Amino acid sequence: EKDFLPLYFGWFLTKKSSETLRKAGQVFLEELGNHKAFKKELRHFISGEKLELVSYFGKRPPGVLHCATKFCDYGKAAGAEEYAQQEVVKRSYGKAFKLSISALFVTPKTAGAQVVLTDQELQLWPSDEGLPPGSRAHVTLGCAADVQPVQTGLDLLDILQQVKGGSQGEAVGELPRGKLYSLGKGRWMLSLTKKMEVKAIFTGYYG
Ligand SMILES: [Cl-]
Ligand SMILES: [Cl-]
């Protein structure tokens, strides 16, 4: 009888760190919704007055927030066994880490936070494109009704791809904690003046 792996590995934020990022995320969806530049380009955000984004991203993580590394599906996913067998993964299991979050973003599908992993933390990132490894690292804050949390990372990569070309353009707003950027196609990004640090434990979720 074999030992099945978790649903996925990842950094799970503490109560206080989750509380902080959660409320910060809420404050962002409230300011963005009330903002002038957003109300203008609302046609490219919804096919259908004001839109309250906190309600729009109705599906939100219930307990503590997290930053996933490798989706394993208890060993069914490709490379799950290989990832879990790594010394660095087994060594890091249950240990605390400090994740740096550089920006919060919003798309028609998801709302999340961009994670900038350290070189130490990148060793825990699966190497199973076009952007540097770990660019997909994120914390999902919310999803639209028929969107799956896996979308959040994909949305982030799409936004970072627009940053490669430099389609970010000039900041279309100054929020209390950073500069607002309009990427188009209902995509928005808040570059934080100060990268907020969150405390999290690297472990495995079984669900
Ligand atoms: Cl903040
Ligand atoms: Cl969808």
Residue numbers in the entry: 161 to 208, 213 to 292, 300 to 378
Copy the relevant paper text.
2′,3′-cyclic nucleotide 3′-phosphodiesterase (CNPase) comprises 4% of total myelin protein in the central nervous system (CNS), being the most abundant CNS non-compact myelin protein4. CNPase consists of an N-terminal polynucleotide kinase-like domain10, a catalytic phosphodiesterase domain11, and a membrane-anchored C-terminal tail, which contains a cysteine residue that undergoes isoprenylation. The catalytic domain enables the rapid hydrolysis of nucleoside 2′,3′-cyclic phosphates to nucleoside 2′-phosphates. The CNPase catalytic site, lying in a groove between two lobes, has pseudo two-fold symmetry and contains two apposing His-X-Thr-X (X denotes a hydrophobic residue) motifs, characteristic for 2H phosphoesterases 113537.
In addition to the catalytic His mutants, near-complete catalytic inactivation is evident also in T232A, T311A, F235A, F235L, and Y168A. The inactivation by the T232A and T311A mutations was expected: threonine or serine is found in the catalytic motif in all 2H phosphoesterases, and in CNPcat, they are involved in all stages of catalysis, in achieving the correct substrate binding mode together with His230, His309, and the active-site water network.
